[PDB]
Amino acid sequence: TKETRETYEVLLSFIQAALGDQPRDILCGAADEVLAVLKNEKLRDKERRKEIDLLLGQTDDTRYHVLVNLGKKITDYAPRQVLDLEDLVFTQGSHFMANKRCQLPDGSFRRQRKGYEEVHVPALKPKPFGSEEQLLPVEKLPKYAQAGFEGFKTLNRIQSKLYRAALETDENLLLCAPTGAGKTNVALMCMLREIGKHINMDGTINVDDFKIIYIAPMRSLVQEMVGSFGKRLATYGITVAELTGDHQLCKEEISATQIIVCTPEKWDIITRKGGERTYTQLVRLIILDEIHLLHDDRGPVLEALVARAIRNIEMTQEDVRLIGLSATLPNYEDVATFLRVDPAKGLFYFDNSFRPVPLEQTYVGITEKKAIKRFQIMNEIVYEKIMEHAGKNQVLVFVHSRKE
């Protein structure tokens, strides 16, 4: 009843204040359980209070009385055809787990404990260096590009793998390489080629011939990218910036800006208004960074960008380089077709063995019937992880909420 419901809401608020942000199933369950204990008559004196403290965390001598009061104030315990895009478009996009089955590695195993399954996989084994092979120093690659690589004596294995197609071809690129492989410095070269395409004897990198567009999936990423891209490409004398501009105040500002970085969305609105149509035809290069965002709900935007770019090039007959960067995932040849990358000379694939620091991943899950119980189990799991971080290693926990 309402006389009761109005108190239930207050109880929920009180439980929320203790726990903080949590899944709805778990918080509600805990509240129902705290209330259950209060209502039940098998516990007397400190005992019930102690049990509540163990469950809801430390409680002020003043807060417990209020909780008890709430409990006491509780009365009871051909022509086209129309189709539905709802059942068609996939719900919870990018979390779908579409593949029917997953193949476990030999190293990986399963050990289930009470309330939680724990999975362990060891570190990967680096592919042996090829016979008569070696990493390219910053010497043996073309004269001009070498500038701005200072502090760095040698190229990474993968960087060294594809540098040739990077600087010698306008063929579109796709690389799939694990986190840590240092992917940026590959794309950097793809830029140093274009920066080199316009050069003079008595002046270097004359900058009004090219405007480059770097599309990155996240906002901070844009900041830091303009930050390092500036330093790197500065040898050519090129100035870049983030496109946060409101359309009209900063257009004439970004008029003088080259190699601008932005989120796909920004590029799409700004093209819909036409802020782009003053820029374009001065654009020989667009970078799609983390193009696997195609799988996200945000995916259609990237799809809208690239589609427009291609469909447009067919009218103008003036072409543009397109450089895709993706995490290592199948459907690579499909994204290739999409970017009009010639699979022959333009396609690049590398599997999970190329992550610079090999990754041994263990997965732990809770099969608890009740969310309330599951929340308690999660805390216990963290403690086990902490013990391993007992030695000289760095541990780090990414929680669902900042407050949490």
Partner: protein, 269 residues
């Protein structure tokens, strides 16, 4: 009292005042024929109804001229809004009459005010107000200036026009007590007068120079002896943000609340 609830109820109410605007009635009753007859342009009437509120009386001051070669009709060409505040039964507006250049071309015809409940008489508060203006102002002629009462009828607006009789003027000059039934009040004090709405010409507004007109939400900032200038511009609505600073000035907040949810996601523009 505080009427915190009252401020909101009436506020979402008044957002429909413009509906009234297109249903209005006008008192037709016996024409003296020796009297003047006043024409009110419909546009100012609409706007004046639209700025008002259904409890507090608001008032406006009438300015007009008689058309050429037709001295017995007074066209009302202008309404002036001055710093003021109302009650449900009356309106307190300052001693100074409008002074301004656009006004020099015309004569004052009296005033007009909103009247929450319809009464078939000129409220004692009114005859008293009018007489007391007239006492202090020779500029206002007894026979030429009127009080137009605009009452809110259901889903509608309905209006009448009064003149003080000399009996009335004397009573009102004299009268102290502002209660709803003062001593010596009589129906002999006022007289109905002939008024017509018109779509033939447009009236215009005059409005306070450095502020707006509506002081209801600051009563302590209003004084009988307060001075004001004017400008050519339209009145803001009763509940308009400007008339209520105290309410938009309710913020007690520590900035660091923003620390929470420091995930900033934007990726636009």
């Amino acid at each position: 009292f505080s009427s915190k609830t009252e401020w909101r109820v009436r506020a979402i109410s008044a957002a429909n005042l413009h509906l009234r605007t297109n249903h209005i009635y006008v008192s037709s009753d016996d024409i003296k024929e020796t009297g003047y007859t006043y024409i009110l342009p419909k546009n100012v009437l609409k706007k004046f109804i639209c700025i008002s509120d259904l409890r507090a009386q608001i008032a406006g001051y009438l300015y007009g001229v008689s058309p050429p070669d037709n001295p017995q009709v007074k066209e009302i060409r202008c309404i002036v809004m001055v710093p003021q505040w109302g009650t449900h039964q009356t309106v307190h507006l300052p001693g100074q009459l409008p002074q301004h250049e656009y006004l020099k071309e015309m004569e004052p015809l009296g005033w007009i005010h909103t009247q929450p409940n319809e009464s078939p008489q000129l409220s004692p508060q009114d005859v008293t107000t009018h007489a007391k203006i007239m006492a202090d102002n020779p500029s206002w002629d007894g026979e030429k200036t009127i009080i137009i009462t605009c009452s809110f009828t259901p889903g509608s607006c309905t209006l009448t026009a009064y003149k003080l009789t000399p009996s009335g003027y004397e009573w009102g000059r004299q009268n102290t007590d502002k209660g709803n039934n003062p001593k010596g009040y009589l129906p002999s004090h006022y007289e109905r007068v002939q008024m017509l709405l018109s779509d033939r010409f447009l009236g215009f507004f005059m409005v306070p120079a450095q502020s707006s007109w509506n002081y209801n939400f600051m009563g302590v900032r209003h004084d009988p002896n307060m001075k004001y200038e004017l400008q050519l511009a339209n009145p803001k609505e009763f509940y308009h943000e400007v008339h209520r600073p105290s309410h938009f000035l309710n913020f007690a907040l520590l900035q660091e609340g923003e620390v929470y949810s420091a995930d900033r996601e934007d990726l636009y523009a």
